[PDB]
Amino acid sequence: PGATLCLGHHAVPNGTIVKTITNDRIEVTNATELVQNSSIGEICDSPHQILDGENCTLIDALLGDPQCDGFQNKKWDLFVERSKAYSNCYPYDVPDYASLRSLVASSGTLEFNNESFNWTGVTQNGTSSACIRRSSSSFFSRLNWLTHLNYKYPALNVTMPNNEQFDKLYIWGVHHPGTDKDQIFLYAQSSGRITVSTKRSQQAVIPNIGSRPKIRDIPSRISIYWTIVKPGDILLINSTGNLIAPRGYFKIRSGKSSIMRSDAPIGKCKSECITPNGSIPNDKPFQNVNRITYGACPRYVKHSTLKLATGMRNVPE
Amino acid sequence: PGATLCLGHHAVPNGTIVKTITNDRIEVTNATELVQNSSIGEICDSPHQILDGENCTLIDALLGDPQCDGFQNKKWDLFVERSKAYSNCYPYDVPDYASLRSLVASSGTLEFNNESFNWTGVTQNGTSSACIRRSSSSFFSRLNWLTHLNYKYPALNVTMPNNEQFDKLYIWGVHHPGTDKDQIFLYAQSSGRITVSTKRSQQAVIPNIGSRPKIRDIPSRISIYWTIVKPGDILLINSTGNLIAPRGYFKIRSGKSSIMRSDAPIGKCKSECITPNGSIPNDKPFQNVNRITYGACPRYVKHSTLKLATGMRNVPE
Amino acid sequence: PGATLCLGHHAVPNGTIVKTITNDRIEVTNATELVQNSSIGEICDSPHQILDGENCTLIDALLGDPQCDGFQNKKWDLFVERSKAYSNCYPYDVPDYASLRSLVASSGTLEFNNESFNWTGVTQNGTSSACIRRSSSSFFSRLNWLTHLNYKYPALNVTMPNNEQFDKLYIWGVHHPGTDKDQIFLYAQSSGRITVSTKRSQQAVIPNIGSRPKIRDIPSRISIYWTIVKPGDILLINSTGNLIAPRGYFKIRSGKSSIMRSDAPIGKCKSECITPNGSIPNDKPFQNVNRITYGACPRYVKHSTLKLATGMRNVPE
Ligand SMILES: *[C@@H]1O[C@H](CO)[C@@H](O[C@@H]2O[C@H](CO)[C@@H](O[C@@H]3O[C@H](CO)[C@@H](O)[C@H](O)[C@@H]3O)[C@H](O)[C@H]2NC(C)=O)[C@H](O)[C@H]1NC(C)=O
Ligand SMILES: *[C@@H]1O[C@H](CO)[C@@H](O[C@@H]2O[C@H](CO)[C@@H](O[C@@H]3O[C@H](CO)[C@@H](O)[C@H](O)[C@@H]3O)[C@H](O)[C@H]2NC(C)=O)[C@H](O)[C@H]1NC(C)=O
Ligand SMILES: *[C@@H]1O[C@H](CO)[C@@H](O[C@@H]2O[C@H](CO)[C@@H](O[C@@H]3O[C@H](CO)[C@@H](O)[C@H](O)[C@@H]3O)[C@H](O)[C@H]2NC(C)=O)[C@H](O)[C@H]1NC(C)=O
Ligand SMILES: *[C@@H]1O[C@H](CO)[C@@H](O[C@@H]2O[C@H](CO)[C@@H](O)[C@H](O)[C@H]2NC(C)=O)[C@H](O)[C@H]1NC(C)=O
Ligand SMILES: *[C@@H]1O[C@H](CO)[C@@H](O[C@@H]2O[C@H](CO)[C@@H](O)[C@H](O)[C@H]2NC(C)=O)[C@H](O)[C@H]1NC(C)=O
Ligand SMILES: *[C@@H]1O[C@H](CO)[C@@H](O[C@@H]2O[C@H](CO)[C@@H](O)[C@H](O)[C@H]2NC(C)=O)[C@H](O)[C@H]1NC(C)=O
Ligand SMILES: *[C@@H]1O[C@H](CO)[C@@H](O[C@@H]2O[C@H](CO)[C@@H](O)[C@H](O)[C@H]2NC(C)=O)[C@H](O)[C@H]1NC(C)=O
Ligand SMILES: *[C@@H]1O[C@H](CO)[C@@H](O[C@@H]2O[C@H](CO)[C@@H](O)[C@H](O)[C@H]2NC(C)=O)[C@H](O)[C@H]1NC(C)=O
Ligand SMILES: *[C@@H]1O[C@H](CO)[C@@H](O[C@@H]2O[C@H](CO)[C@@H](O)[C@H](O)[C@H]2NC(C)=O)[C@H](O)[C@H]1NC(C)=O
Ligand SMILES: *[C@@H]1O[C@H](CO)[C@@H](O)[C@H](O)[C@H]1NC(C)=O
Ligand SMILES: *[C@@H]1O[C@H](CO)[C@@H](O)[C@H](O)[C@H]1NC(C)=O
Ligand SMILES: *[C@@H]1O[C@H](CO)[C@@H](O)[C@H](O)[C@H]1NC(C)=O
Ligand SMILES: *[C@@H]1O[C@H](CO)[C@@H](O)[C@H](O)[C@H]1NC(C)=O
Ligand SMILES: *[C@@H]1O[C@H](CO)[C@@H](O)[C@H](O)[C@H]1NC(C)=O
Ligand SMILES: *[C@@H]1O[C@H](CO)[C@@H](O)[C@H](O)[C@H]1NC(C)=O
Ligand SMILES: *[C@@H]1O[C@H](CO)[C@@H](O)[C@H](O)[C@H]1NC(C)=O
Ligand SMILES: *[C@@H]1O[C@H](CO)[C@@H](O)[C@H](O)[C@H]1NC(C)=O
Ligand SMILES: *[C@@H]1O[C@H](CO)[C@@H](O)[C@H](O)[C@H]1NC(C)=O
């Protein structure tokens, strides 16, 4: 009579197709997806400190456009710039805009310390109807539009030492008036010149008078520049007109801070990984949601799906 | 008596040596090469639309050097620049030449639309004996050399709105005459100034008078600049002399177009992959022909040969 | 009675833990480390030709700061810049400093050939008390500070052809004096202008008069520029004041030369691979000593240890 003893393995009714080195379609008992392909559609506000820029670019929060006053001295891990953002102050450009945005985003703070420059022989606090703060002609909060006093603009030659233990970031500008009349009306002479220097750097700018296409009726422009002053170094601002002066300095830190362009809403939840589409889970090693990421994120790949086998070959019958 | 039954495998007289993880030389029955190591020596004219630059660089076809007139309004997938190319018009330089070449190559068209600027109070259509078109002093086809009329050069302040649905690329320049005599002879005053602006950009250039080493007897130079004008934006050209003006705009597209330096002839054949050496087959995943490629190409590697085993270990006797 | 024959394998009392695809800790009989994690703490002077910069940056050895006179005409495979380096000549900056440093480091030579420019109508060999050579006011060895002769500075317009078979690298500058008095005291007129050109390039610089913060009592600055002249091309130096002129050219080679910042001492020993920490052995394929390397080096990785099994699984008892 005897007996029979059969050795065997399980199978399932609902197997999953995976790829191998030798077969592009083979059925296994179970698999798990390694490419995260979805976001929750919102940026979770923990654990990273998120600053929603709302109507303001980071640079407009830096300069101090009036709609951005609530951003003064704020800090962030990630600044979120919205596509609806708009400027509503004096028209300006920034040569190497991208670099200024980057270095400020990376620093993660708009901490600003006022300094007294002793501007002697000029009118301070120039305003404009293109920059309205509380129904009143105004200007960039962190900039000081210096004009003539008594049809005189004497040569400024001003020193600000850095006696602190941290670096200072000075933001300043140069006014390019629309016509020759304006050049005289504000600075009482035809040729501006600005030199901003330290021991190790010098930035000399000549204004360029003329019409640019009008933005809120203004054919003139301000061009923005920046200067970092190390401890033991000295800012030296030598100018004879057309200086849009600093009111102080920004702290410049190094850390983990950045900036991202997104229109996703901010939600009350926890997620380590942020993309412009929203936060994504980070269990999986890869993702195809967005090449732009911040935090502990799966690596971006161009595959919609990669299934890792977690069981044997499925052999029904 | 009984029988014998032997199990076995084939072998071949002409095996091939491959590399493995454990052995750098092992013989298998057959292998296939994964590194493409040869080109046909010519650039196949299908499936990619090839434009042979012949004696012309892309920038000379853009500006409109007289030998390049046949390139007006042409389109390409790949522009091929030959090493025999030479310029034969007024000497010029392009600050950030590489970027202009790149953006035009990438756009893939020299489609040009003429516009009427209404230059009032200046002579248009200045010519030079260094730029000969049909045995006649001439100039860049797409540029307009403006000089004085009646020893007067009044301040130009000219607007061209972009009311189209596509971007416009303006190419223009600044004449740097050789001596002070020339500055007066052409512009009837000593100091040129050019400002070209949009709502968002401004490019201000001062000419610089003096001798550069002569090229076809010319110690003067033109410097070339470009300006992109978006829909709803406005070009504004404010100048008091030394303007080499645009006659219109180039369409600027985005697509799959590029440029390549090669001396390989163009042939009538089909090949997806182009290198400077010529077209290469793209069956193999890798190639060692050239790091420069266009199209569906094997990836460049620093290996002359990589043989993939396609059979068992070859064990003769 | 019969016999027993047992098949088996060795084991050791002192096994080593390795990682596999399926197990992060498994014991094998032996392993070898693939990440080099230590340096000898000194830069071996063979087989690479090492030039210890000591108190001198490469740029100070180029210009010819007096403490760097021993570097004249030296060659290197690797120039080593020390953190104690300091400048002790006239204060200067170099726009795109990084690029000048790179191209000279890569060239691997300070071979300098004097040329006669025939400076006619100017005083040559201007000196300064900020640049002391042998207890005597002096200047950069490779630069020629041209000032007025008899309160006249006539317009220089000087040509130097390259009739050699190699490229020439010209280094030159522009003096930015501290005040308007100085501008007259040295150049006997208010407006300098410098144009340096070749057939294919032009560099026009305007000086900018004013105070920068003093360095060894000097509020003025020299700005350094460079020009490469190919065979058959011509240097043309057109200037009306404020030219810090070249005394000749540097040979510019291409080869395997570079530069490294390190404070490690130089030792008498042989090692193919150099890092800022010192030379490292290059038997192993990887290293975690430094991302900065020169020579035949293991590849930098972010792992402290990677043990490759060199024996079977160790199964004691
Ligand atoms: C150089 O030319 C430009 C272009 O014409 C001049 O700027 C233009 O000035 C006019 C006159 O004020 C502006 O027109 C006005 O527009 C407003 C806005 O809707 C409207 O309310 C008025 O009825 C009038 O049409 C126009 O905006 C402006 N154009 C641009 C592109 O900025 C400029 O004045 C000239 N330069 C000098 C120094 O005059
Ligand atoms: C600044 O100096 C330069 C260099 O000497 C002057 O340019 C030179 O001008 C001469 C005189 O016309 C040119 O010489 C001629 O060359 C042709 C070409 O083969 C030949 O047919 C003539 O017999 C004569 O030798 C020379 O080409 C030219 N050199 C360079 C490098 O461009 C320049 O004129 C001076 N600046 C001013 C404003 O005068
Ligand atoms: C523009 O303003 C600056 C800043 O005040 C002026 O430069 C400064 O000039 C003074 C006077 O010589 C220097 O002070 C001296 O310092 C030395 C060094 O220890 C000391 O021995 C003297 O007793 C005296 O205190 C000062 O160094 C210098 N400051 C800087 C930052 O460079 C400059 O002179 C003004 N511009 C013009 C054209 O005058
Ligand atoms: C198929 O395999 C996956 C991965 O092994 C299983 O998913 C895990 O399930 C456990 C429950 O025991 C969870 O705690 C884990 O979070 C899951 N891991 C992952 C990576 O998702 C899944 O349960 C398996 N399915 C079956 C039917 O056994
Ligand atoms: C996440 O956002 C990206 C970027 O917006 C989305 O990818 C874009 O999708 C649009 C329209 O669907 C395409 O026209 C673009 O070409 C895509 N951009 C890129 C860079 O590929 C993406 O679909 C979003 N993903 C998820 C899961 O929401
Ligand atoms: C050695 O192996 C290669 C690859 O398997 C064979 O080359 C293929 O041959 C077929 C003919 O049946 C062609 O249609 C394919 O285009 C070839 N493939 C490649 C990648 O070249 C080759 O024939 C084999 N040699 C022998 C003797 O069997
Ligand atoms: C394809 O073209 C390249 C570039 O011309 C060739 O590689 C060069 O060959 C020359 C002389 O034979 C060498 O001096 C260069 O160093 C090579 N350049 C590079 C970048 O490596 C290459 O041999 C050609 N290949 C084929 C198959 O024709
Ligand atoms: C453990 O394995 C390593 C690598 O196989 C052995 O190290 C080698 O030892 C030989 C001596 O026969 C030396 O010549 C080599 O330079 C060593 N190679 C490396 C990469 O270090 C080691 O000896 C083995 N240990 C034992 C006990 O067998
Ligand atoms: C080799 O040198 C590097 C660079 O100096 C050392 O790494 C730095 O160590 C300091 C202090 O120990 C840290 O503050 C830095 O963050 C490190 N720099 C980087 C870029 O990581 C390194 O320890 C040295 N390695 C050895 C083996 O000596
Ligand atoms: C942003 O700007 C829009 C349009 O001007 C305005 O209606 C809205 O209230 C602003 N929102 C914030 C948060 O400032
Ligand atoms: C200018 O404005 C600043 C900042 O608000 C203020 O402290 C100061 O009173 C004003 N100064 C002058 C000179 O009007
Ligand atoms: C500041 O520079 C201007 C011109 O750049 C000059 O007139 C003035 O003397 C300088 N400052 C002083 C007070 O020296
Ligand atoms: C290109 O230039 C050469 C030399 O000037 C000339 O002989 C040739 O005909 C030109 N070829 C074309 C296609 O324009
Ligand atoms: C200048 O040349 C253009 C383009 O060929 C032509 O349309 C026009 O007739 C000329 N204009 C003047 C003012 O001579
Ligand atoms: C154009 O600019 C010049 C100087 O830049 C100026 O004289 C002129 O007024 C400007 N155009 C007009 C007509 O306003
Ligand atoms: C380098 O400079 C220091 C400090 O001035 C000096 O004491 C030392 O002798 C110098 N060393 C060399 C090698 O020039
Ligand atoms: C200037 O110095 C150079 C280099 O030391 C020397 O050859 C020459 O004699 C001097 N020239 C004049 C004009 O004083
Ligand atoms: C050199 O340039 C200056 C102004 O840039 C000019 O006055 C002079 O004529 C030029 N050289 C000569 C001798 O032509």
Author numbering:
A (entry chain A), B (entry chain A), C (entry chain A): 9 to 325
Passage from the reporting paper:
Since entering the human population in 1968, H3N2 influenza A virus has evolved extensively, especially in its hemagglutinin (HA), due to selection pressure from the human immune system. The HA glycoprotein on the viral surface is responsible for cell entry and is the main focus of the humoral immune response. The HA RBS is a shallow pocket on the apex of the HA1 globular head, and is formed from four structural elements: the 130-loop, 150-loop, 190-helix, and 220-loop, named after their location on the HA primary sequence. The HA RBS engages host receptor sialylated glycans and consequently is relatively conserved in sequence compared to the rest of HA1.
We further examined the structural basis for the loss of E190D reversibility in recent H3 strains by determining HA structures of HK68 E190D, Wy03, Wy03 D190E, and Mich14. A slight shift was observed for the 190-helix of the RBS in those H3 strains isolated after year 2003 (Fin04, HK05, Vic11, and Mich14), but not Wy03. The Cα190-OH98 distances in HK68 WT (Glu190), HK68 E190D, Wy03 WT (Asp190), and Wy03 D190E are around 9.0–9.7 Å, whereas this distance in Fin04, HK05, Vic11, and Mich14 is around 8.5–8.8 Å. The Cα186–Cα228 distance in HK68 and Wy03 is around 4.5 to 4.9 Å, whereas in Fin04, HK05, Vic11, and Mich14, it is around 4.2 to 4.5 Å. HK68 has a Ser at residue 186 and Wy03 has a Val, whereas Fin04, HK05, Vic11, and Mich14 have a Gly. The presence of a side chain at residue 186 may increase the Cα186–Cα228 distance, as well as the Cα190–OH98 distance, and reposition the 190-helix further from the 220-loop. D190E imposed a significant fitness cost in Bris07, Perth09, Vic11, Mich14, and NDako16, but not in Shang93, Mos99, and Wy03. Secondly, lowering of 190-helix further entrenches Asp at residue 190 and disfavors Glu. For HAs in recent human H3 strains, lowering of the 190-helix further entrenched Asp190 such that D190E reversion completely abolishes receptor binding and viral replication.
